[PDB]
Structure 1
Amino acid sequence: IKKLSGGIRTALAQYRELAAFAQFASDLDEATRKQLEHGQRVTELMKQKQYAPYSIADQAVSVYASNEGYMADVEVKKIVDFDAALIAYFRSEYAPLMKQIDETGDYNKDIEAAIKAGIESFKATQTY
């Protein structure tokens, strides 16, 4: 969690900086437009309904997907539902790993390879 929260924090700060450009037409140098898109999607990621506590493992998976930008392609208006779908697939297909991430919290480099491979598989095969 400590190694993954920096990206979300800095993205939110950058988005908070570029505020009024949201109301105005966003046409601008790419960098600003890309920052605006990423800020919109990251603030959309924070939505969460009531009485549904997310675990550490799915939290890490979601934050890693956000930081790596696997959710850039998906339309913003459909992000949150997509989010849930991903967790579901990951929850059942890659369940043995989730017993380890939750119980230990270690970030041995391998945990990253498995998460990335699962994310690639879900993006390639399943549909939201």
Structure 2
Amino acid sequence: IADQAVSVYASNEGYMADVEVKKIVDFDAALIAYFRSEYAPLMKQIDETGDYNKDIEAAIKAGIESFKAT
């Protein structure tokens, strides 16, 4: 669930209207790797529940900035 969750988050946050057209999907997959490596407890927790909390999206955007840095 977190996969498409973070994808749509990035889209709505305009986090995609900024990066390369073709590189979109590459960024996506590398983002999945980035997070499920670093944030594996985070996505585990969120997908085990299906509920969202604001601090969760805070962690999400933190990961957003960290991966955009990478």
Normalising by structure 1, we get a TM-score of 0.51
Shift in Å at residue 122 of structure 1?
Answer: 0.9
Shift in Å at residue 99 of structure 1?
Answer: 1.1
Shift in Å at residue 79 of structure 1?
Answer: 1.1
Q: Which residue of 2 aligns with 1:10?
A: none
Identical residues among aligned pairs (%):
100
Shift in Å at residue 73 of structure 1?
Answer: 1.6
- Mapped to 2, the partners of 1:77 and 1:106 lie a distance apart of 32
Q: Which of structures 1 and 2 has the larger relative contact order (alpha carbons within 8 angstroms, sep 6+)?
A: 2
- Mapped to 1, the partners of 2:6 and 2:22 lie a distance apart of 20
Q: Which residue of 2 aligns with 1:65?
A: 10
Greater C-alpha Rg = 1
Q: CA RMSD in A?
A: 1.0
- Mapped to 2, the partners of 1:113 and 1:81 lie a distance apart of 23
- Mapped to 2, the partners of 1:92 and 1:77 lie a distance apart of 24
- Mapped to 2, the partners of 1:84 and 1:65 lie a distance apart of 13
Shift in Å at residue 115 of structure 1?
Answer: 0.4
Normalising by structure 2, we get a TM-score of 0.89
| Structure 2 segments unaligned to the other structure (5+ residues) | none
Shift in Å at residue 96 of structure 1?
Answer: 0.7
The size of the alignment, in residue pairs, is 69
| Structure 1 segments unaligned to the other structure (5+ residues) | 1-55
Shift in Å at residue 117 of structure 1?
Answer: 0.6
Query: SS at 1:74's partner residue?
Result: coil
